[PDB]
Design a protein around this ligand. Sequence first.
Ligand SMILES: Nc1nc2c(ncn2[C@@H]2O[C@H](COP(=O)(O)OP(=O)(O)OP(=O)(O)O)[C@@H](O)[C@H]2O)c(=O)[nH]1
Ligand SMILES: Nc1nc2c(ncn2[C@@H]2O[C@H](COP(=O)(O)OP(=O)(O)OP(=O)(O)O)[C@@H](O)[C@H]2O)c(=O)[nH]1
Ligand SMILES: Nc1nc2c(ncn2[C@@H]2O[C@H](COP(=O)(O)OP(=O)(O)OP(=O)(O)O)[C@@H](O)[C@H]2O)c(=O)[nH]1
Lengths: 196, 191, 196
Amino acid sequence: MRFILTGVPGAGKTTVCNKLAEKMSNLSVVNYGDVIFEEAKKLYPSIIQVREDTRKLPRADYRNIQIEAAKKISLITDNLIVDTHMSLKTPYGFYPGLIPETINIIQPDGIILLEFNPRDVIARREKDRLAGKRVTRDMESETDILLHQQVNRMFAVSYSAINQCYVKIIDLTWPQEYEFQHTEYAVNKIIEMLNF
Amino acid sequence: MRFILTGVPGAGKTTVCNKLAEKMSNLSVVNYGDVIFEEAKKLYPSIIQVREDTRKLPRADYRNIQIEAAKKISLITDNLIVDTHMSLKTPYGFYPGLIPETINIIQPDGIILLEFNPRDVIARREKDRLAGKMESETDILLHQQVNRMFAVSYSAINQCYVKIIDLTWPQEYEFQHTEYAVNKIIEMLNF
Amino acid sequence: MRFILTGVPGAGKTTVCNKLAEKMSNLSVVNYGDVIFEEAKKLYPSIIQVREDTRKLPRADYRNIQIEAAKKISLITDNLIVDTHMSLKTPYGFYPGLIPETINIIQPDGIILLEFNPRDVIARREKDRLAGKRVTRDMESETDILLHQQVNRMFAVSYSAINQCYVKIIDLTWPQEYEFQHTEYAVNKIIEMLNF
Ligand SMILES: Nc1nc2c(ncn2[C@@H]2O[C@H](COP(=O)(O)OP(=O)(O)OP(=O)(O)O)[C@@H](O)[C@H]2O)c(=O)[nH]1
Ligand SMILES: Nc1nc2c(ncn2[C@@H]2O[C@H](COP(=O)(O)OP(=O)(O)OP(=O)(O)O)[C@@H](O)[C@H]2O)c(=O)[nH]1
Ligand SMILES: Nc1nc2c(ncn2[C@@H]2O[C@H](COP(=O)(O)OP(=O)(O)OP(=O)(O)O)[C@@H](O)[C@H]2O)c(=O)[nH]1
């Protein structure tokens, strides 16, 4: 099947993607941002080198790369998880991470949201910064993260009302018995979905 | 007027629909699911015999039935209540009961969401089940919030009303919720 | 830039609009519904003399006035704020204040939501009937106002899923240490947005 996998950043979503790829042969796990960066370098190289470079040029060009990234992902034939974000926080507010052409071209069966406890999100984001990852990203509060996760629900139901797809919310907000168990439980629920 | 009437399953929406059919003529109450299931046994006799088998159908085939099922309803005159569900829970997640075209074909004035206390829902579902007819109060809270988000999306898209009928208070006598819901809806139809 | 500015009624949104236009230079502030009153008088002057009189216009020609109002607003060329409502409570339930035409015609960059604590909203709506503004008393509860605000978020995020715009939630729910502090805060957050 096809599913779009989403959650707030820095909370373990990549750990879920990396571990799915390892436990399922009949599965491609692609990162929509990676492909968008890849197809950007292609179209205009002197203007594109690093990952952040994507944002600089006008939306007319950025949209047209999102179209082509989507089309390539659409060539994938086996099971597909597309790793993406329902929305990003900006000084102007939240902004959709998808565009409507992304869902028409990928024709996913549904959207998966990983919902984390905000205290975990804060802890994990702060130990990665201490290691050296996501420097000068604002320390968000518990209610910031809560607000982001609700908004994410709304975006996804909107896309469901428009495109007739499933909306699957995985609860990872309980206390872990051991480390990386949240990702373990996410990874088992998602394979159960692909195998049902 | 025409309203889409909705709520989580097993909670009393069917009792509300029946007491409308009892207490207000000049009004057609139509169960959208029954219409759809019937129309599925006409076109694909073989594949469908469980209402659950409606999505074994390829998307284009399942779309087309819900279009047709909508057209028949669409041909009705005077007041009309279309009983259905904003979403249903499946192993892949929440899925919408309406499709984009359903709303335009039927041109409803608004959507009605019957909202219950999840504790009354657990109790009611288990009562029924005991007489022949699996979710926590958190699962049910989530479901009612999703239906609320589906409703508001359908309203932004087709410019219709979104009526939330609050049935979450404790009853002073049995079937009070149902009275209250029917009176609120009849008052909406007459105004 | 262009933002649509919204909030439950009677809570402080018009105060915010007035303070913005008196403070930040060369910023246009427009109240969609005032523009709609004018457009209905120039068009139907025998039948609407009070703005409240538009109800008995056919819903089909009222819609046309919203478009004509939207078309006028769309010719403003500097920074722009459109004061309006995401939804209003009627006896048929909530109804959207915008129409799709309004947003495609105005091409707003963003939607701004002023979120208030419902006790403040009740208190403000009360002080304003004592100042002879409204003739009749508002009986919405605390939970009515939370509900109205929750529905307004969902409308905002839908318009953003559909039109690809920002959704900015300005939290005015904390308690005021002094008078008019919320309004001050929302004004300064919005100006910081426009000068970013
Ligand atoms: N100690 C510990 N760390 C965890 C646990 N679960 C997740 N993490 C850490 O939390 C961080 C998760 O961040 P990522 O998985 O890289 O998130 P991301 O979505 O890829 O970030 P973006 O690329 O910006 O979208 C990693 O450093 C994980 O090691 C846990 O149970 N215990
Ligand atoms: N996916 C899913 N569908 C359900 C569930 N429960 C009920 N349904 C749907 O509900 C329809 C049957 O009518 P019900 O929804 O049970 O009854 P009602 O209209 O809500 O009214 P009451 O019986 O008084 O509660 C079927 O077509 C099912 O698809 C559920 O737990 N999961
Ligand atoms: N005393 C006091 N009043 C306030 C404060 N903040 C807002 N208000 C009042 O709240 C009331 C509502 O203000 P607005 O919403 O800006 O004006 P409105 O035209 O009456 O209504 P809308 O435009 O629909 O929002 C006004 O009478 C304001 O003066 C405050 O901090 N202290």
